[PDB]
Design a protein around this ligand. Structure first.
Ligand code: QB2
Ligand code: CL
Ligand code: NA
Length: 138
C-alpha cells in the first residue's frame, strides 16, 4: 500500500510515448478520485471521477492555471466500480493525453499546457487504496 494523497515525481516532465500506470482499488462507497498532472502549481491535466454528482457518475477533466479552473470536459462512460481493483493508464501523445482504464480506451484530453517537459509531478488523491504508480516508455 501507498499513502494517499501521493506524489509521483515525473523527472524532466512528460514526453510523447511516456505511459503512466496507476494501480489501486476503489474504496467501497467512494465519492471521488483525482489525478493531477502538475506544472508547478498549475494542473496541466486533472482527471476526476465523481461517483455521485446529482446521482450520476461522471468523469470530469480540466486544467488549472494561476489557481483558476478552465472549461470542463465531461465523459459519462464510467469504468470504475466501488470496491474493485483498477488500472489507469495515461499515455502522453503529441497533441493529447490518452486515458485507458482496465485496458479499455476511455478518453483523450488535448494539451492546454504546452511545456510538457515541465509537467514534473503526478498527484493522486481520493477514495482509493493505492498500490502502484510508475511510468515507462512504449
Ligand atoms: O470545491 C469543490 O466543491 C469542487 O472542486 C472541484 C475541483 N476539485 C476537485 C478536487 C478533489 C480534491 C481531492 F482531494 C480529491 F480526492 C478529489 F477526488 C478531487 N479538488 N478540486 C475540480 O474537480 C474542478 C474541475 O473543474 O471542479 C470543481 S471546482 C469548479 C466548480 C465549478 C466549475 Cl464551473 C469549475 Cl470549472 C470548477
Ligand atoms: Cl470532485
Ligand atoms: Na527546468
Amino acid at each position: 500500500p501507498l499513502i494517499v494523497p501521493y506524489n509521483l515525481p515525473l523527472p524532466g516532465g512528460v514526453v510523447p510515448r511516456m505511459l503512466i500506470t496507476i494501480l489501486g482499488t476503489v474504496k467501497p462507497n467512494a465519492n471521488r478520485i483525482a489525478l493531477d498532472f502538475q506544472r508547478g502549481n498549475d494542473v496541466a491535466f486533472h482527471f476526476n471521477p465523481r461517483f455521485n454528482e446529482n446521482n450520476r457518475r461522471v468523469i470530469v477533466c480540466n486544467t488549472k492555471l494561476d489557481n483558476n479552473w478552465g472549461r470542463e470536459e465531461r465523459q459519462s462512460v464510467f469504468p470504475f466500480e466501488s470496491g474493485k481493483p483498477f488500472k489507469i493508464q495515461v499515455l502522453v501523445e503529441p497533441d493529447h493525453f490518452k486515458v485507458a482504464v482496465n485496458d479499455a480506451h476511455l478518453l483523450q484530453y488535448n494539451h492546454r499546457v504546452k511545456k510538457l517537459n515541465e509537467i514534473s509531478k503526478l498527484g493522486i488523491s481520493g477514495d482509493i487504496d493505492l498500490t502502484s504508480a510508475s511510468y515507462t516508455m512504449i
